[PDB]
Write a protein that binds this DNA or RNA. Sequence first.
RNA 1: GGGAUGCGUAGGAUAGGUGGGAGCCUGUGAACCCCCGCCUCCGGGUGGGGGGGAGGCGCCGGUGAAAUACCACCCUUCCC
Length: 229
Amino acid sequence: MPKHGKRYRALLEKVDPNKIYTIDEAAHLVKELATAKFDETVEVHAKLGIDPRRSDQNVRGTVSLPHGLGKQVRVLAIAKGEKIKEAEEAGADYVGGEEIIQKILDGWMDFDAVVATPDVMGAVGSKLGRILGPRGLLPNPKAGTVGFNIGEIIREIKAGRIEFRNDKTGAIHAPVGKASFPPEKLADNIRAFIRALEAHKPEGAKGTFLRSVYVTTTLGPSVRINPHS
RNA sequence: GGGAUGCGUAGGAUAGGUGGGAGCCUGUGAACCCCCGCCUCCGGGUGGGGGGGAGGCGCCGGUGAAAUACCACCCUUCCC
Ligand SMILES: OC[C@H]1O[C@@](CO)(O[C@H]2O[C@H](CO)[C@@H](O)[C@H](O)[C@H]2O)[C@@H](O)[C@@H]1O
């Protein structure tokens, strides 16, 4: 009946809204802000000094988190020839060709990432572009999700190679681990995401790039942080 | 500083963006009834209050370009 439940209201008292925390402080506090009945994902949020309306100020990139995402990633790989066996033995959850394209086309969605070899991307683009596109699941050499080293790509994605892309309002968000992680490992992951983010600052972007940065848990409150700590 | 606002069509119906998400809320009072302010696309929405006394919400499915609880950073148009 209030705006929040007693669980959440108990967490809110544990943060200081006026304080900008160091990354090390946030990394250590995060265990206290995670009281859901599952292992909560830790998230980093940044309000960016860009104009999201212009293409040359988009922020899009990937980063390999030093200590991963802390969760299984079901990877569907679309390949042909010897690469099918490569994808299989590299541990992709699903490996198919023409027929798996068909299956996705009819609304099968039970996977977390899609990767593909180049020599199948023609078909994947035309047929699946419409259905994976507006969900960001379409494989693409930009995101490291397309290549003939399909084995290596599957292992990199299982190891928590994330993509990040600002939203139309000028904010950006990413998962960076689990609240059960050791704090130093969380800190490593946070700093790595911030590092990758800053490396994608647009040349013509005006003013401070990271206008604000926050760390939070899946169902908990947030703490504002100093990205340069 | 504080508080509102977000509805083509289809779809429970009022779906602003993205990210997180498989759980969330509830005798620390669910459903439901009633009163008031605000907002309204006139469907309802939202905030508070008076009662009530045990169940709600999400997920899956379905519709859809997008799916919904809960949580985070934001944006639009406004008010005190
Ligand atoms: O998106 C697939 C993956 O995400 C989860 C939550 O982590 O489900 C989310 O995405 C679904 C696909 O649209 C939504 O329907 C669902 O409501 C949302 O939580 C997982 O359940 C799923 O494996």
